[PDB]
Write a protein that binds this DNA or RNA. Sequence first.
DNA 1: AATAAATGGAATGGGG
DNA 2: TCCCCATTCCATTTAT
Length: 91
Amino acid sequence: KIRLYQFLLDLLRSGDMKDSIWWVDKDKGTFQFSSKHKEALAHRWGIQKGNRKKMTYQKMARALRNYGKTGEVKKVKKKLTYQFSGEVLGR
DNA sequence: AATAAATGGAATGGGG
DNA sequence: TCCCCATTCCATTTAT
């Protein structure tokens, strides 16, 4: 099964949900979600995973928070903005 | 207040 | 057994 950070990186690479997520500074790996259109992206994550309940942005962001310590994704001090690690970006 | 976002502990569920 | 990689639930705090 695909990991959440890889799902998000793949979306950014494909441009399939450009109104829900975008690079802010792609060289640094910073990206941001749409305030108004993030829920459609969260729904897609839950469906891809086959989860029991409907996925929400809040639950997706709760999973993103768990990457902070291991480092794959960190929260940036702007709203709805995160940053991939260099290791994630290279792979 | 209404609306949104953030913080994050804890219980529960996946697939080895 | 017990870690992986989340998902789900819930209470609380901050937004300037």
